[PDB]
Structures are given as C-alpha cells and as structure tokens.
Design a protein around this ligand. Structure first.
Ligand code: SF4
Ligand code: SF4
Ligand code: SF4
Ligand code: SF4
Ligand code: FES
Ligand SMILES: [Zn+2]
Lengths: 125, 118, 77, 69, 61, 123, 86, 48, 78, 77, 694
C-alpha cells in the first residue's frame, strides 16, 4: 500500500474523507458546439449533498448554500495523477471512463451512388 | 383587497397597491409573482410601512402597445433606437426586420412595430 | 469569457513610489490566471523593521515606519 | 440633499453650465410616463422594502382525490 | 485610429496578429546542451552527414 | 539580523523516529506546564485538568501515525501552536475553538440513529 | 425457514472457477426447477466473479456458500446441503 | 446577462423568460450594493 | 509560523483543493458573548462562470525565437 | 505583465497617458506619505496643506475614470 | 486499407477513401467547420475547411477531398489564413446583430471561429443594408429566427436521412435561399429537437428554454435518460435548484449523439405538479402532514389490518431506480410477502419469457448490432414510439446496406420500408414458417425484435413459444457468435426489476391484497387496487397514483438521485445528482428503510456503500457500470423459459394493438409537462400541418 496520508496535514476537515464522494471525468464533447479543447483535462468535482446544495432565500430570491465544494473543480493532466492525489488526500472517487466517437469512413461519393432498385430515399444535398 | 395569509388570518391591502403596476393589473410573464402572493409571503416586512411611497413604476408592455405602427416600402425595415438629438450611438444595434408577412413585426430590442404599407 | 492569454509566466516590475512593486503571473492558456503573487515592497520593509529598529527608542520606531510609510493593505496582500 | 431634484444635482456640482430651466428642448428626455420625485425616505415608513419579483421555481401540487370505482 | 490598422484594403489580420506569434518558452536540459557541445549548432555545425549523424544525435537524446 | 521570537524552535527534520519521540514528549510536557498560563491569559471558564485532558486528546489523535515525515510536520505544527498560545497572540475565540464541549448543550435533538437523521434529511 | 423461495446463481462466463457450475446450469436447471416448483431460480453472470449461490427462505433470511469445487456432483451435494441447512 | 458575467463582485442576479408579447425581458434584476465596488464594467458591457 | 492567516486557521489557502470560501465563518453569539466559529453557510452561493470557457483553441503554437547557435543541428541529407 | 504575455504593443498616446498619470500618482502618494510621517511626528499642518493639493489632483481622476481614488483606468492593452 | 500521409509535418495513418478532416482529427490538428458533422452526410457549402495540398493549385475542401497516399497538407500557411478570414467576412456580412437575444450566445461556433480564425473588424458598412428574412412557424418545440441562417444544410440532411421528415427543404435560389417548409407545416418527428443541437447558429432554438439562461451560469452534469429503456446518456444543465434543459451526450453503443423529444422536453415537468410534503387522506380531502405522522399512520394500518403472507402488494412503475426496488423487495419479503409486481397490465402474474436468464428479456444482440443486421422482424412493436433512437439506427443501416424488414403488428407509420404482413399470431406462424422464415435462415446476422406489449398480453406464452421454437430451430439466429432474439422494453425499470427478481409468484398472483405499496406507479387502472385496501404512493409527481392514495410520500426524480438504471442491452449505467430533491422530499431507499424500521422489521444497510454491496449480492452486473456482457446460456435459456412452460397457452384471435397510443404523455413526468400537452395537441395526424399531400 504505502501511499502517504496527506489528509492528516492538509488542515481540512475529515468529513471530506469519510462521507463525501468525488467524480473524476473528462468533460463530454458538447453537442451545441464542435470544439474539443475543453476536453483532454481530467476534472475532479464533488458530488452533491442534498440538504445543503441550494435553497431559495425568502428575502430577495437568491440561492443559498452550505456545501462549500459546490464550485471547486480541480483540473488534472491524466487519470493517474487524479487518482493519486485523491488517494493521498483519502477521498473516495468514481472514475467515469469517456465515450469516444467511433471512426467510420465518410465519402462525398456515397451521396451520388447508383441505385439498381427502388430509391430508398431521395437526397436533397 | 383582502388577502388570506397562510396562517389563517387575513391581509387587507387597498386596490391601488395590488395592481402589478399603475397602468396594468395582470402579470406579463408566467414566472412573475403577483403582488398578492408577494404581500401574502412578506407582510412581516410591509406591516408598519407606507405603500404609497414604495416604488411603483409603469409597465412598458402597455406603453409600447400604445405606440403607433410604422410603415415602409419594401421587405425590410431598419431599426436603431437612436436619439438623433445628442452625440454618439445612444441606441440599440441595427436590426433589419422582415415585413413581407401580413402582420406587424417588432424589433427584438425595442418593441416598435413595422408593416408593409397595408 | 475574456481574452485568452498565451501560456507562460512572468515577473515584471516597476518603480512604484513605495519601491519596486511586482507581479508574478502564470498562465495556462485560459482567460483565468493560474497564479498571481503580488510582490509588495512594504512587506520587505516591515520585515527589515526588526533589523532597523534594534537599538532605537519608540519615537524613532514611529519615524521608521513613517520612512517606509507602509500601506498595510499592501503589507497584508 | 436628497430633496434636490435631478438636473440641479448635476448643475449643482459643476457638471454643466446650463441649468434644466434653460437647457433647450431636444436635450430634454422624452417621457411617456408622469414624473414623480421621491426622496430618500430612509428611517421612515416609506423606506424601500425589497421583495422577490419571482415565484417559487418548483411549483407543488394542489391535492385532488379520486375514488376506487 | 492609426493608418495601417484602419486601412480597409491591404490590412490582413494575420500580419498584425502579434499574439499568435508569441515566442515559445524554450527548455534546455543537460541532454540538449551536451549535443550542442559534442556536436554544434546550425550556425557552427560539427556533425556527420547522413543517418550516421542522425544516430549520433540519437546517442545523446 | 532578523532574530527569532521567544519560544521559536528552528525547523529541523529528524531522520529517525527515536529522536522525534523525545521532541514530541518535550512538547507535551511544555503544554502541560503552561496550561495554567493558558487559563490565566485567556479568560477561561473551566478547569486546568480539562485543558490537560484536551491536550491528551489532541496528542492521542495522531498517536498511530508511522510515516516519519508526517510526524515531523505534526510536531512542527504543534510547536507553532504552543508559540501562538503561550505568547498572548491568540485571543479567546481562537483558543476556545479547541473546547466546543465546554459550551452549553446545543439544543435537544442531536441525531445518532437513522430515523432521526431521515426526519431531518441528514442521512 | 418454512420454504425455499428464491435461488441466485452467480458465476463467471469464461473463468476457471465457474465451469463445473456452468455444466450444472446447462444440464440440471429444469430438474432443479421441478424439484423446487415454488422458487425463483435466477442465474446471473459477470466476468471475474467468484462462483457462489444465494438462497432466500422466508422473511429475507438468506444463506450462502461458494461453489469453487471441481465437479458437477460436488455442486449438487453442496447446493442440496445449503437448501437443507435452512 | 453580460452585466451578470463581467461583474467582479457577482452582485447582479437576473432571471428572464419570454414575455407575453413574445419578447425577451426580465422578471428579476437585483443588485446588492453591499457587494458592488462601483467599477462601471456593467455600463460598459450593455449593448443598449 | 503563519503571518497572514488567522491565528487558529487550519488549512493552506492557495492550494487548488482548498475552496474559495474556506470552511468556517464567524459571528457574535449573544449567549456565550464571544466571536464563535461556525460552519460556512452563504446567502448567495458562488457562481463560477468558468463553465463558459472556450471550446476552440484560442492561441495556436507560438514562434521559435531560439538563436541558431542553440538549435540542434540538422545533419546534411547526404 | 499581461501585455508581455499577450505580446502586444501599446499605442503611443496611451503610453504618454500612463506615464503622466503614473507621475500624478507618485505625487499623490508622496504627499500622503511625507505628510503622514509628519503627523505621526507631530506636525499636523503640512498634512492639511497638502491634502488640498491631493484633492485638486483627484478631480483629474474623476474626470478621466469617474471615481475619486479606486479607478481602473489603465487596462491591459 | 490504412495509408500514410503528412499533416503540418506529423505523420498519421487512416483507411482509404476517408476525408482529410478525419485524418486531421486523428493527428490532433484543429480544423474549422460548419457543414461537417460526423454522423451526417458530407457537403461543401461552408467553405471554411480549406487547406493547402501540394498536388492541387487552389486550396481544397478537407471535408470532401479524399485522402491519398503520400499527400502533404499544411493548415498554417498564409493562404489558408487569408481564405478563412475571407470566408468569415462573407459569412458575417448578412448576419444580424442579434447576439444578446440569441440563445446560442456563449456556445456558438460562429463567435469562436470568428475570434480565432477571423478579422477584428468588418468592412461592410453599406447603406442598402443587410438581407432580411421572415421567421417560420414549424411548431411549438422549435423557435426560429432565420435571419441567422448560414445555410449549412445540417438540418436538411438530418431530417431527410436520419429522421425521415422530408418536409424540411431548401427553397429559392441564390441569396434569397430560404431553408423552410415551402408552406406552413410542422416538423413532425420525434427526433425534431436534435436539429437544435445541430444548428451552429441560433436559427433553431428550444422554445421552453427560449431565454431562461445563458451557458456560463449552468452546472453541467452527466446523467442518464429515463423515459426510454435505451438509457440514452445526456448532459443536464441546472441553475441552482432549477433544471433549465437537457442535451445529448455521446455513446456510440447506445444513442450515438441523439435523444428523442420526450427526453429533451419533459424537464418542464420536474418543476410543476410536484410533491413537496407528505399527505394523508381523511375523507375526500388530503391534509398536509409530517413524516413521523404518515409513517406511524402506515404502521397503524399494518397492525390494524394484519396482512398475512401475500396480502402486501408492491408495485414498481416506470422511472424507478434499482436501489429502491431492491429495498422495497427486501422489505416486502421481510413482512412475509412475495407479491412484487410491475405496473404493467398483466404485471400481477409472472412473465411468459421468464426472468431466469438475462438472455430471455434483453436486447441480446447489442444496439450496435443493428448496424451489422441483414434481416429484421418486428413483432408487436413500433420502434418509432419505443426507442426512437434505435429506429434511427435501423434506418441508418437500411440505407447503406442490404436490409429487408418485416412486421407482425399494427400497421406502423415507419421511417423505412417495412413490408407489413399481419396482425395476429396466425400470420406470425405463417410468415416465420413460409417466406420470411427462409429470409431469416439465409441471413447471417438476423434479428427478431419482440415488443414488451407482447409481455403485456394474456396470450404471451403462445408467442414466445413459437419464437423460441423458431430460434432454436434456426441456427442463424442463435450461434456462438450471434444471438438474434431480442426483447425491446419501453421503460427503464423493467430490466432492473427482472434482474433482481421482482416478479410475482403464482401463489401471490391470486390473493386479493390488503395493503398496496405502489412505487412510481401512475398507470394503474382502479381495478388492480381494491377500495378497502390501504395505499401508499411514492413518487415525485401527482398525476394518477396519488389520487387513489390514502398516503402520499414524496420521492425524487432522476435529476435528484444517483440511481442505477439498466437498459435493454443489460448495460448498467450510473446517474448523477444534479440538484437536491425539493422541499420535504427524500431519496426513496431511505424512506423504505425508515418505514421498515417503523414496521416490525428492518433492513441491514444504512448508507450508499452498503446498498451497493447488496446490489452485488443480488446481481454482480449491476455494479459493472457501462460494461455490456455476452452470455453463454442462450440455448438453455430458450429451452427452459420460452418453449417449455408456454405450450399450454392457446393463442387468441385478438389483433395486436399498439402499445403506446401517444409517444407524448406516457409517464408522470411527461403528463405533468405542459409542453407535452402543446405537443400532443399539435403533432397529431388529424391536423393539416402534420400531413403532406403526396
Ligand atoms: S459597476 Fe457595480 S454593479 Fe456594475 S459590475 Fe461593477 S460592481 Fe457590479
Ligand atoms: S441588457 Fe444591459 S442591463 Fe440587461 S442584462 Fe444585458 S447588460 Fe445587463
Ligand atoms: S436552418 Fe440552422 S441548421 Fe439549417 S442550415 Fe440554417 S443554420 Fe444550419
Ligand atoms: S448565431 Fe452566433 S453569431 Fe449569430 S447572433 Fe447568435 S450567437 Fe451571435
Ligand atoms: S466543412 Fe468543408 S466546406 Fe464545410
Ligand atoms: Zn429597434
């Protein structure tokens, strides 16, 4: 084993180590855009605790919170660094393996191929 | 108006202050809270206060329906809410509205309407 | 979003009236900095204050802090 | 000083050389609504009360019952 | 405004893009410095031609 | 030269557990001898024995830590706190952070089984 | 323990420990289901798991033993013991 | 919601929806003047 | 010893695991008559807005400015 | 710092303005500094003879920025 | 065969006939695009992908130039930079200054690629001004502002190739080109909203999200789509406690970039007609109550009524986790009851196909297997209404391959040619033994898709017996390389239920229950539940089952619980919590542990990790997240479950009926959504807008 417990010298609470879950992941490729720069980094974000995530204030309508890790998102270069840092701090983690687009050939010619039988569909462009 | 509190009591408020604005009673958006639900939820902080002096600005949804329609010759109307009186832009970005369709069409920034001469 | 600064890092400095002020910025290709340390001349001044005041009486300690005219919002960063 | 109407609060302050009384017409803002000047009523009942213009985001269900016919 | 940047015709941005022309952060470990020593540099070469000199670089890499 | 303050120890990372044992024991001894000063300087509303009990608890917290570097870090942090306390740098609040127990019972329902946590949405 | 009411088999698909239980399942399942006509017989597979059986008699009392044996017959007798030792 | 994004102090709080006349408008616009630093980035971003 | 942070502060702030707001806050307890440290609870939560970060690479690779005396020589092709 | 990272060049008029306001600022700092040293040493008067000069120089601030002290005039680029 | 080439000096290998842009993607070189989407056909209208190839004099289109051995490609030299700046100048000539009111601000490709590959300032100041265009009215779900179109033709290609909605086309010519239906129509397809994710510009925008929020404000969470048994991965976007929208996520073995309209527009049902407090019935009224009071009321009902054995019924509906059904099952049994049961019509009795082997009630040949299909059969299923995404996959395979399809069911208005051939068991045996039987034998990768409405019939055994006899009889469907028997479920709970048991025993199937704990169930009929029984609904929305209930206990929706959900393939997926459940609502398994303790029993687990170790003790594939597993017991499974105990059922003459009479308004979340109400009033066949006179 022999992975140091820096959780003891971190000065942070122990509730993060004993009750709180994280998730390690890559941001999914957005469908609203076609870029892929926001990916390639392994984020680490805490999972919610229900009672203290958000609740609406009576006075003016602002959203409150008691969870202090609702906005912290560490960024890592690789999965192994994330897992090591988590274990060194004693956090329990679930790994979310990414889902990559599967390569398939694409030709402009397939739009204009011969149909020996009934046209399946009529192309526009 | 007499508004029933949650705790079974009543909340008396005069009619001039229950209107959503001095020119309109109803709400102009689904998520808007009506003044009655406001009072009913917040009378602890309205109790000894004077409602005449609280801010009650006019609504724009009713002051812009009053503005006459404008007309143009063509399938385009250009809008730029520019003052024309002082320097600078002072308005909103140029927007070309299509007006071929039978009805009026309003700019998305300001609600000024345009029509195809008919 | 703001503008994307190139990756890198730099300490650049000036002749601020207090002294040699400086900023140590780091970049990661994002619109948000990764680190920014303000080097504050009043910091080193107050740090030397112990070396400078030894042997002197209290009115002179007042005059010493006045020579440096530390602005403690800087000193505390 | 809250009793000072706008325009004057700017002339009184050397923001302009021309007063609202003599400023020309085109320089005056047009108003589709009436004017109504109200000072800082702080410390008095007419102090501004804040509130939420919205209603609760999560609307609950108003019960109604059925019978097991 | 200034003239060559307000010019409307022969004023491409890719010539006055000084941000994407930023100078790289060079890095030199002892390996990359001994090659400059045992071999030389593009200004003062001391390297053998052909795949021989290629593997000579490789011996230091 | 910028000279060290009163009870300052130079940071020195021991290479062995057998020396750090001695240094930790001296720290514990100093805390105990100085506890009455921690009761006088800070206007305290309880016993010197209760302070010594809390000190023993804080040293039992990390009693089962076998990694040497972490122990050196813990010892340095503890000497920092002794210097903070014995010199009157801390005020009452920062000291009674270590004594939540002495303050009055916070309410009635302090859940310890499931069902109460569920009724309070803490499970 | 008034009755058996559910049986769950867990096993690998292709590991070494599970093959005798794979044979038991392929060959004896209908006879098991007729000799116990009132029970949910459940087979559920997953690569890398250690073959094992669970039974549920009444009021949720569940029993369990592994089936890392080297024969189909050891499986039969071991299953039957767990079904009897209610 | 550019004023809500550039504001250093995050004082502003907005919530919009489609108005009855089919336009884009606000139902909530708040400012905490106890969070405001009076920078003027909000009068700079607004394109109207 | 610490110089900036509070005398009893437990944590190291500029670490990337340390949340912006910290873990604690202070109020005056009329009962105890003491400034007392309690767990954090904010009336408006932190909104990051770093989720609007660009999906396209903003500034491509730079431009070499190594002097040629420090460039690893290219062997002559033959 | 941020221009050095972005690798852009400031225009000349902006350089001269940043200079002029840098020196107006050094005046505004040396005034407060010297004339607080005085007051801590007991001479109350040079303080109030200088702060008026500071208050004439802050009109230039409110004219260019809008704010009297904390301003934000100089920005990257 | 893989070739090799050069790109900005780097060397890469990809198959022949491929697009250069795919190679560039392989080599990491970032290239712009508007007209190119991976899942769509190619075109070359945007002209932003231009690059320099030494073979050709002009810059060429990466989106369309075939890749060839030894070709060298630069994407950095001054010609490319100029050509990109010029194209973007041209694109933004006639683009309106609508960015503040455009819902794509902060997530528009045009902004980013103009800032990155384009000019700081424009030279279009002309006084005649920009082109204009009118907005179309293609239905409630899609809002239009067509001055913003760049004529990428993603919308057209999607509609006509992946969806089957050819009402969307390219009218006009030249600068007066106008994408639209030439006359007022509606974009009638259940995949209509994916168009919104395809348009780069905000010319097609979601309507119930229209202006509510901006992307930088949103907490993106990666979760799972209930509303179908497919388990389509998604990305939720919350604004604190509120859930603004849903958008798809990538998974090539399940959903492959698409999601249906129900899953994208049912979010509006998670903020209205919710349950926030417990309720008790005292007469005709409900009365708000505490948790202590309702659970104690449940206990007094148990002790007063004294249900014995199988009188305690448990009903789990659609939109349930697997942790909840486990906890309900362990509790039910701990009270001495085996009457666990689905909310299906014939849920009272055990399924015809048997839960014994996973292979009998799952889509065995995985959803990535339809691409390899040659012949298909549809028995009592309308995939366009049960898992539309897999109808899209069938069409994608039907176009580019040799595929011949048949159906035995109600005539279904499909997005493909189907060759309907009956509506009865009699025509089913006829086809399977006549012609299409021979087509399935002589196929290499055949599929026999059975709907779950067959399982929801009284004569289900007569079917599953015949299909099992044919499957075992025909090797081509069942081998050591291919299982062509498939059951398509229409809800996300049934597979997890069957994986943990949750089937009624025949002993309990005949008892008339005394207490009725119904979980997420809103499809009940008022006949399945007696009058004199005590009833306890758990849900997050009050639509049907609450109205019956004497006691109502809030639960949480899919956005507020990290539940495990199992899909048709048997793939286990884990959800994520986006928000906390509202008000006095609680996670279900906690509620059942607490009421269990209040009753004369308990469950042996307290927190998450213990519930997970339990799930493993029930079935170890419930904690192999995202892994789909093969199975070795196919032959045995069809011999033991489908063929054996189903010979005694006789087939009816009742013709098959469509399982889902309305794709909208299927479950509680959706019935509570007004958007599904507007969308079920329109998008009806009887409306003129939804039928083209061909
Ligand atoms: S000027 Fe004031 S309100 Fe506007 S962003 Fe700055 S601090 Fe906020
Ligand atoms: S229009 Fe102006 S005030 Fe309104 S949200 Fe935009 S920037 Fe803020
Ligand atoms: S309508 Fe939208 S999706 Fe279709 S081509 Fe135009 S911009 Fe693209
Ligand atoms: S589509 Fe993009 S560029 Fe066009 S108005 Fe919308 S945000 Fe702006
Ligand atoms: S991406 Fe090639 S021209 Fe459109
Ligand atoms: Zn306008």
């Amino acid at each position: 084993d022999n992975v140091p417990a820096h959780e003891i010298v971190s000065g942070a609470p122990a509730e993060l180590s004993r009750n709180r879950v994280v998730r390690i992941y890559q941001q999914a490729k957005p469908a609203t855009q076609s870029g892929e720069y926001g990916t390639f980094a392994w984020r680490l974000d805490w999972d919610i605790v229900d009672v203290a995530n958000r609740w609406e204030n009576d006075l003016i309508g602002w959203q409150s919170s008691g969870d202090y890790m609702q906005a912290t998102q560490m960024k890592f270069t690789s999965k192994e660094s994330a897992i090591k840092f988590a274990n060194k701090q004693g956090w329990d983690f679930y790994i979310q393996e990414p889902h990559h687009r599967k390569f398939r050939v694409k030709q402009y010619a397939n739009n204009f191929v011969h149909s020996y039988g009934k046209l399946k569909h009529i192309r526009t462009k | 108006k007499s508004i029933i509190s949650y705790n079974g009591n009543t909340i008396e408020i005069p009619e001039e202050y229950t209107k959503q604005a001095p020119n309109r009673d109803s709400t102009w958006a689904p998520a808007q809270a009506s003044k009655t639900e406001i009072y009913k939820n917040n009378m602890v902080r309205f109790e000894q206060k004077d409602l005449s002096k609280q801010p009650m600005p006019y609504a724009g949804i009713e002051l812009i329906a009053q503005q006459p329609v404008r007309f143009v010759h063509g399938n385009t109307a250009v809008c730029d809410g520019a003052n024309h009186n002082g320097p600078g832009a002072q308005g909103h970005p140029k927007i070309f509205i299509n007006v071929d369709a039978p009805g009026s069409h309003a700019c998305q920034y300001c609600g000024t309407r345009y029509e195809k001469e008919h | 979003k703001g503008y994307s600064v190139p990756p890198g890092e730099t300490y650049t400095a000036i002749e601020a009236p207090k002294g040699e002020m400086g900023v140590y910025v780091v970049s990661d290709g994002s619109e948000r900095p990764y680190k920014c340390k303000i080097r504050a001349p009043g910091f080193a001044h107050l740090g030397a204050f112990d070396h400078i005041a030894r042997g002197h009486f209290l009115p002179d300690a007042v005059a010493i802090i006045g020579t440096m005219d530390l602005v403690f919002g800087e000193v505390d960063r | 000083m809250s009793q000072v109407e706008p325009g004057w609060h700017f002339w009184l302050g050397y923001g302009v050389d021309t007063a609202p009384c003599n400023t020309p017409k085109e320089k005056l803002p047009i108003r589709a609504y009436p004017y109504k000047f109200q000072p800082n009523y702080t410390g008095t009942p007419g102090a501004f009360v804040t509130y939420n213009t919205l209603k609760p985001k999560i609307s609950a269900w108003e019960p109604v019952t059925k019978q097991r016919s | 405004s200034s003239y060559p940047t307000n010019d409307i015709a022969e004023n491409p941005y890719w010539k006055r893009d000084h941000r994407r022309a930023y100078p790289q952060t060079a890095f030199f470990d002892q390996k990359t410095v001994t090659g400059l020593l045992e071999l030389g540099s593009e200004a003062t070469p001391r390297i053998a031609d052909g795949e021989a000199g290629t593997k000579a670089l490789a011996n230091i890499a | 030269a910028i000279i060290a303050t009163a009870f300052a120890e130079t940071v020195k990372f021991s290479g062995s557990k057998q020396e750090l044992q001695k240094r930790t024991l001296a720290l514990y001894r100093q805390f105990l001898r100085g506890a009455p000063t921690f009761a006088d300087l800070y206007e305290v509303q309880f016993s010197i024995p209760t302070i010594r009990t809390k000190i023993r608890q804080e040293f039992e917290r990390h009693r089962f830590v076998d990694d040497l570097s972490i122990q050196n870090v813990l010892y340095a942090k503890g000497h920092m706190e002794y210097q903070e306390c014995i010199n009157f740098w801390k005020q009452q609040a920062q000291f009674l952070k270590y004594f939540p127990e002495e303050d009055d019972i916070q309410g009635r329902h302090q859940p310890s089984n499931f069902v109460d946590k569920f009724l309070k949405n803490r499970a | 323990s008034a009755a058996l009411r559910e049986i769950r088999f867990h096993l690998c698909q292709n590991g070494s420990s599970s093959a005798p239980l794979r044979q038991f399942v392929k060959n004896q399942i209908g006879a098991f289901q007729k000799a116990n006509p009132s029970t949910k017989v459940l087979v559920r597979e997953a690569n890398g798991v250690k073959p094992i059986v669970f039974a549920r008699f009444d009021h949720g009392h569940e029993s369990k033993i592994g089936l890392d044996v080297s024969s189909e017959k050891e499986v039969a007798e071991r299953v039957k013991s767990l079904i009897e030792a209610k | 919601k550019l004023c809500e994004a550039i504001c250093p102090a995050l004082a502003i709080t907005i919530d919009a929806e489609e108005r009855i006349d089919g336009s884009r408008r606000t139902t909530k616009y708040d400012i905490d003047m106890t969070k405001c630093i009076y920078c003027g980035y909000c009068q700079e971003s607004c394109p109207v | 010893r610490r110089i900036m942070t509070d005398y009893g502060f437990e944590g190291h702030p500029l670490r990337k695991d340390f949340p912006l707001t910290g873990y604690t806050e202070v109020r005056w307890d009329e009962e105890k008559r003491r400034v007392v440290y309690e767990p954090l609870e904010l009336t408006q939560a932190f909104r990051n807005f770093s989720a609007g970060s660009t999906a396209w690479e903003p500034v491509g690779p730079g431009r070499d400015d190594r002097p040629d005396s420090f460039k690893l020589p290219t062997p002559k092709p033959e | 710092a941020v221009e050095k990272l972005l690798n852009v060049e400031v225009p000349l008029r902006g350089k001269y303005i940043r200079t002029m306001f840098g020196e107006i600022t050094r005046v505004l700092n040396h005034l407060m500094s010297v004339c607080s040293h005085a007051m801590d040493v007991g001479a109350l008067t040079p303080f109030l003879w200088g702060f008026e000069e500071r208050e004439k120089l802050m009109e230039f601030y409110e004219r260019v920025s809008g704010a009297r002290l904390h301003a934000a005039y100089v920005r990257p680029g | 065969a893989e070739i090799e080439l050069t790109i900005d000096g780097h060397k890469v290998s990809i198959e022949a006939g491929s697009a250069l842009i795919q190679a560039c993607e392989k080599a990491g070189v970032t290239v712009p695009r508007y007209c190119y989407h991976d899942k769509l056909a190619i075109a070359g209208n945007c002209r932003m992908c231009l690059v320099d190839v030494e073979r050709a004099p002009k810059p060429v289109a990466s989106c369309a130039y075939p890749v060839a051995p030894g070709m060298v490609v630069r994407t950095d030299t001054e010609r490319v930079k100029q050509a990109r700046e010029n194209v973007m100048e041209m694109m933004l000539q006639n683009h309106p200054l609508d960015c503040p009111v455009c819902d794509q601000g902060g997530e528009c490709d045009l902004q980013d690629q103009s800032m990155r590959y384009g000019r700081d300032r424009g030279r279009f100041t002309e006084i005649t001004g920009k082109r204009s265009t009118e907005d179309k009215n293609i239905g409630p779900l899609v809002k239009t502002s067509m001055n913003r179109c760049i004529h990428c033709t993603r919308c057209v290609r999607f509609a006509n190739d992946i969806a089957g909605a050819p009402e969307l086309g390219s009218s006009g010519r030249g600068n007066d080109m106008q994408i639209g239906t030439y006359l007022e129509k509606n974009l009638n397809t259940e995949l209509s909203g994916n168009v919104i994710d395809l348009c780069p510009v905000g010319a097609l925008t979601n309507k119930p999200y229209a202006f509510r929020a901006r992307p930088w404000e949103l907490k993106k969470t990666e979760s799972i789509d209930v509303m179908d048994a497919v388990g389509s991965n998604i990305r939720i976007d919350s604004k604190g406690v509120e859930v603004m929208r849903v958008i798809p996520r990538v998974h090539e073995d399940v959903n492959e970039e698409w999601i249906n309209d129900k899953s994208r527009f049912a979010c509006d049902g998670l903020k209205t007609q919710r349950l926030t407090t417990p309720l008790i019935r005292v007469g005709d009224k409900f009365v708000n109550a505490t948790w202590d009071d309702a659970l104690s009321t449940i206990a007094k009902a148990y002790q007063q009524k004294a249900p014995k054995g199988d009188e305690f019924k448990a009903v789990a509906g659609a939109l349930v986790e697997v942790e909840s059904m486990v906890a309900l099952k362990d509790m039910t049994n701990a009270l001495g009851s085996e009457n666990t049961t689905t909310d299906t019509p014939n849920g009272n009795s055990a399924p015809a196909h048997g839960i014994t082997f996973r292979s009998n009630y799952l889509f065995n040949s995985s959803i990535a297997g339809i691409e390899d299909a040659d012949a298909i059969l549809l028995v009592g299923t309308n995939p366009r209404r049960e898992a539309a995404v897999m109808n899209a996959r069938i069409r994608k395979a039907w176009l580019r391959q040799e595929l011949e399809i048949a159906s035995v069911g109600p005539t279904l208005d499909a997005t493909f040619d189907v060759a309907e051939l009956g509506n009865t068991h009699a025509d089913l045996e006829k086809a399977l033994s006549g012609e299409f039987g021979e087509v399935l034998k002589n196929a290499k990768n055949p599929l026999i898709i059975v709907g779950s409405g067959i399982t929801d019939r009284e004569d289900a055994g007569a079917f599953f017996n015949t299909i099992g006899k044919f499957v075992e009889s025909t090797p081509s469907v069942l081998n050591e390389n291919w299982n062509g028997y498939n059951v398509l479920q229409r809800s996300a709970s049934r597979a997890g239920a069957y994986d943990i048991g949750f089937t009624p025993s025949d002993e309990a199937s005949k008892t008339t229950p005394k207490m009725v704990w119904l979980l997420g169930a809103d499809e009940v009929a008022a006949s399945d539940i007696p009058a004199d029984a005590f009833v306890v609904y758990q849900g997050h929305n009050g639509d049907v089952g609450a109205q019956f209930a004497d006691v109502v206990l809030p639960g949480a929706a899919y956005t507020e619980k990290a539940g495990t959900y199992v899909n048709t393939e048997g793939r286990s997926q884990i959800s994520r919590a986006a928000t906390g459940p509202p008000g006095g609502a609680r996670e279900d398994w906690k509620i059942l542990r607490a009421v269990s303790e209040y009753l004369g029993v308990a469950l042996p687990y307290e927190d998450a990790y213990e519930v997970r170790d339990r799930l493993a003790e029930i079935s170890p594939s419930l904690v192999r997240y995202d892994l789909v597993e093969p199975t070795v017991f196919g032959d045995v499974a069809v011999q033991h479950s489908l063929v054996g105990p189903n010979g005694s059922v006789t087939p009816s003459s009742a013709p098959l009926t469509e399982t889902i009479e309305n794709f909208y308004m299927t479950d509680s979340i959706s019935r509570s959504s007004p958007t599904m109400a507007k969308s079920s009033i329109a998008f009806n066949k009887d409306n003129k807008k939804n039928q083209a006179f061909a």
